[PDB]
Amino acid sequence: MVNPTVFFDIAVDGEPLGRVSFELFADKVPKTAENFRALSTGEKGFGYKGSCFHRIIPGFMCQGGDFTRHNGTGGKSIYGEKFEDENFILKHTGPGILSMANAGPNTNGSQFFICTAKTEWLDGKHVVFGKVKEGMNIVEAMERFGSRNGKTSKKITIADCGQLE
Amino acid sequence: SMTEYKLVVVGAGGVGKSALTIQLIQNHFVDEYDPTIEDSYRKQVVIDGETCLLDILDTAGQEEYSAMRDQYMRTGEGFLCVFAINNSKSFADINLYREQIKRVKDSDDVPMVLVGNKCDLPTRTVDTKQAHELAKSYGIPFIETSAKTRQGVEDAFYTLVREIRQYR
Numbered sequence: 196m197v198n199p200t201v202f203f204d205i206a207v208d209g210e211p212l213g214r215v216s217f218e219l220f221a222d223k224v225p226k227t228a229e230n231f232r233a234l235s236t237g238e239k240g241f242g243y244k245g246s247c248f249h250r251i252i253p254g255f256m257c258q259g260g261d262f263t264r265h266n267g268t269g270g271k272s273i274y275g276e277k278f279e280d281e282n283f284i285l286k287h288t289g290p291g292i293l294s295m296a297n298a299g300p301n302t303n304g305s306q307f308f309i310c311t312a313k314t315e316w317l318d319g320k321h322v323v324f325g326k327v328k329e330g331m332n333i334v335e336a337m338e339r340f341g342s343r344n345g346k347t348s349k350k351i352t353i354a355d356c357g358q359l360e
Numbered sequence: 361s362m363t364e365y366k367l368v369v370v371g372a373g374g375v376g377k378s379a380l381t382i383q384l385i386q387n388h389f390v391d392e393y394d395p396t397i398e399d400s401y402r403k404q405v406v407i408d409g410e411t412c413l414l415d416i417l418d419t420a421g422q423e424e425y426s427a428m429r430d431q432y433m434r435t436g437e438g439f440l441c442v443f444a445i446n447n448s449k450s451f452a453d454i455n456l457y458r459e460q461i462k463r464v465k466d467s468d469d470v471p472m473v474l475v476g477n478k479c480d481l482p483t484r485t486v487d488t489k490q491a492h493e494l495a496k497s498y499g500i501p502f503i504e505t506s507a508k509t510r511q512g513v514e515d516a517f518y519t520l521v522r523e524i525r526q527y528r
């Protein structure tokens with residue numbers, strides 16, 4: 196199974212910041228990879244375009260993907276409201292890791308997070324399914340607008356998104 | 361200037377710490393589940409005819425970070441220890457919070473109120489009698505609340521202020 200590549204064009208208060216691209220590990224977590232791929236293209240008629248990074252905690256991660264409620268509580272998968280933890284083969288090994296947010300076991304939806312450091316205490320709890328390919332400096336720049344509790348000081352949006360490969 | 365009180369709301373995930381705090385501060389019920397990282401609120405109130413400024417720390421109920429609680433337990437002046445009446449695990453967790461506060465503050469004598477939340481729900485798994493005894497064992501009040509209906513909310517927080525006032 197070939198790993199696809201998706202991109203986000205990130206905006207700050209409606210101004211372009213830059214592009215982040217992700218390799219999705221379809222070769223290890225195809226179900227989880229395919230959810231994120233399809234939400235990135237919008238091909239199911241919903242997805243990440245126009246949604247925000249609601250939680251940015253410098254030295255840890257950037258969290259987004261609530262495109263249903265836009266308040267950090269919502270989101271949904273292409274398989275329904277929630278899907279099972281596919282596996283925990285991949286670990287939170289350092290900056291750029293892309294992983295599923297959840298509300299405990301088997302509650303994967305659309306919310307995800309991008310690690311800006313190793314978060315090894317999330318190993319076996321959150322499904323890792325990809326990694327930043329290009330634009331790790333844009334993820335670093337997003338930390339400009341975060342805080343200790345994650346509230347953002349500017350609105351950080353996925354102004355556009357899609358598949359590259 | 362009016363006296364300030366540093367209140368800290370603690371307890372297991374989902375017991376309604378945030379729903380209680382937001383009922384008090386903003387007078388609405390949060391029906392959605394937005395698990396907390398950490399939030400602070402300020403509100404001036406009059407209790408027993410004395411104006412005071414409540415600084416309220418709404419903490420995370422994530423068991424993974426039980427070690428991260430020490431720093432806010434050192435700075436807090438009074439604690440709302442919250443369980444949900446339909447979550448016997450959250451009631452078991454009260455002991456652990458109480459023992460952690462006592463250990464971190466190195467004192468038997470910390471202002472604290474036991475809060476039994478979600479009393480609007482039709483079914484309870486925790487015996488009001490058990491919560492009464494546990495509070496008696498600790499020497500602290502026990503207040504039943506519903507963040508949904510606002511039942512007991514002001515009573516829970518104001519009772520904690522009175523506990524701090526008596527300690528001072």
Ligand SMILES: CCn1c(-c2cc(N3CCN(C4CC4)CC3)cnc2[C@H](C)OC)c2c3cc(ccc31)-c1csc(n1)C[C@H](NC(=O)[C@H]1[C@@H]3COC[C@@H]31)C(=O)N1CCC[C@H](N1)C(=O)OCC(C)(C)C2
Pocket residue numbers: 250252255256258267268269295296297298306307308314316317321343344345393394395396397398420422425428
């Ligand atoms: C104790 C303080 N504190 C910390 C933390 C911890 C640490 N450490 C821990 C590890 N130690 C090392 C071993 C030595 C060092 C010190 C330091 N400083 C902090 C912060 C900055 O101090 C305020 C955290 C943290 C996390 C939570 C609550 C409190 C937390 C929390 C609440 S909800 C959740 N976590 C999971 C959440 N779920 C949802 O959002 C559900 C919403 C509803 O349904 C869909 C949607 C989710 O999936 N993610 C995606 C994954 C990252 C995760 N959020 C998140 O935000 O983690 C934040 C953070 C900073 C990584 C961890």
Ligand SMILES: Nc1nc2c(ncn2[C@@H]2O[C@H](COP(=O)(O)OP(=O)(O)NP(=O)(O)O)[C@@H](O)[C@H]2O)c(=O)[nH]1
Pocket residue numbers: 371372373374375376377378379380390391392393394395396397419420421422477478479480481505506507508509
């Ligand atoms: N019926 C009912 N539901 C309540 C009550 N208080 C809170 N809830 C519900 O319980 C869920 C969790 O409430 P919340 O305040 O977020 O709990 P918490 O203790 O702050 N959670 P956390 O530790 O993750 O931050 C929400 O869906 C909320 O609406 C209550 O008194 N009655």
Ligand SMILES: [Mg+2]
Pocket residue numbers: 377378379394395396418419420421
């Ligand atoms: Mg909360």
